[PDB]
Amino acid sequence: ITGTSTVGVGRGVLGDQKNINTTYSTYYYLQDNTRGNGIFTYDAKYRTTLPGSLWADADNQFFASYDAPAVDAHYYAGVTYDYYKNVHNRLSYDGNNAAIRSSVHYSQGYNNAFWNGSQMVYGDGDGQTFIPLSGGIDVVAHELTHAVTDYTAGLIYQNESGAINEAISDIFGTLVEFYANKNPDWEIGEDVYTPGISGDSLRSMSDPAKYGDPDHYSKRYTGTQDNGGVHINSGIINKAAYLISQGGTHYGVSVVGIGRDKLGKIFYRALTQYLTPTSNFSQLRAAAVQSATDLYGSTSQEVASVKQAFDAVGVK
Ligand SMILES: N[C@@H](CCCC[NH3+])C(=O)O
Ligand SMILES: [Ca+2]
Ligand SMILES: [Ca+2]
Ligand SMILES: [Ca+2]
Ligand SMILES: [Ca+2]
Ligand code: NA
Ligand SMILES: [Zn+2]
Ligand SMILES: [Zn+2]
């Protein structure tokens, strides 16, 4: 909408106070004009019709319980925008400053979040498995990274290409979490998962087997569940990415860690310059190797570490 840019204040899902960019025209809307062609946050009002209504507030104060998922969806979309712009020189998810749209309060008791081809969508959770899912910066950045992938590599959401798609979202979700530097880790969704249980999450990149996911190609899931295992077999790639960044010895194969910044550079270049819609794990290895070669040279430690990491998870 047309109005003047304002700065509201509110609390997120976890009770943390933060400022949010809003727009004033009779009401204060969750419309951030400071980034690209805008970040827009919507209320789905417990329905499944999307996007719902652009979030309107009478006084530019967002401290109600009902406000908190919208505060975080809006704020963390901004952090993610900043990450891609400042770290990768990418302007929004399409590289041309597309407006970023998110809806919160989707459905009732909805224990998930997703990118629907056009926008982000966040459930509130059922209060037991999840609290409102926009409270997790890695969740927000995971979903927005699906938009990046869909506008670049276009990895089909099935089988090995779908597991790469999922792993890319976990990788950059985690790198945004580290970028924001609030309780960063290599787990996915811990801030909004199971409020009665400390230390758990949906997935672990450092140890996928913690939650039953494979950490080696020999353990890949080959059934039909989960679109051929896209959230399961992502663990094989998540582990390789963790090893590239942090190093370690995995099934007797030692990897020299090269750090998160270089991990991000290698995988961003693979995603945007080498992967295609049908890329499989072996083709991802080749893409990461050639990406690291482009950036650092064929004899570099960076290339050697990419090779060791994919060796360690059984991907030739
Ligand atoms: N996002 C993953 C994990 C489940 C989220 C909670 N039910 C999936 O859709 O399978
Ligand atoms: Ca208010
Ligand atoms: Ca964390
Ligand atoms: Ca995390
Ligand atoms: Ca928990
Ligand atoms: Na699991
Ligand atoms: Zn995903
Ligand atoms: Zn998914």
Query: Would you kindly state where each structural domain of the chain is located, as residue ranges?
Result: 6-154, 155-315
Q: Is 203 in the pocket of ligand 1 (CB under 6 A)?
A: no
264 alpha carbon, distance to own chain's centre: 13
Query: Residue 277, preceding bond cis, omega within 30 degrees?
Result: no
Torsion, Cα 212 213 216 219, to 10 degrees, reads 70
The topology under which CATH files domain 155-315 is: Neutral Protease; domain 2 (1.10.390)
Per residue, what are the HEC states of the chain? CCCEEEEEEEECCCCCEEEEEEEEECEEECEECCCCCCEEEEECCCCCCCCCEECEECCCEECCHHHHHHHHHHHHHHHHHHHHHHHHCCCCCCCCCCCEEEEEEECCCCCCEEECCCCEEEECCCCCCECCHHHCHHHHHHHHHHHHHHHCCCCCCCHHHHHHHHHHHHHHHHHHHHHHCCCCCCEECCCCECCCCCCCCCEECCCHHHHCCCCCHHHCCCCCHHHHHCCCCHHHHHHHHHHHHHCEEECCEEECCCCHHHHHHHHHHHHHHCCCCCCCHHHHHHHHHHHHHHHHCCCCHHHHHHHHHHHHCCCC
Q: List binding-site positions.
A: 57, 59, 61, 138, 142, 146, 166, 177, 183, 185, 187, 190, 193-194, 197, 200
Structure tokens at 35: 């980034």
Q: Which CATH architecture has domain 6-154?
A: Roll (3.10)
Cα–Cα distance measured from residue 143 to residue 315, given in angstroms and rounded to the nearest whole number: 26
Is 260 within 8 Å of 175 (Cβ atoms)?
Answer: yes
Active site residue 143: yes
The alpha carbon of 112 and the centre of ligand 1 are apart by a number of angstroms equal to 6
Instruction: Report the chain's C-alpha Rg in angstroms.
Output: 19
Method used for this model? Answer: X-ray
The angle at the Cα of 140, spanning 148 to 230, to the nearest 5 degrees, equals 65
Q: What is the resolution of this structure in A?
A: 1.7
Tell me the CA distances in angstroms from 67 to 7, 42, 71, one per residue in order.
15, 11, 6
114 alpha carbon, distance to own chain's centre: 10
Tell me the CA distances in angstroms from 221 to 31, 166, 211, 227, 233, one per residue in order.
42, 14, 14, 11, 6
Q: By C-alpha distance, which of 131, 269, 102, 264 is closest to 190? A: 131
The alpha carbon of 66 and the centre of ligand 2 are apart by a number of angstroms equal to 10
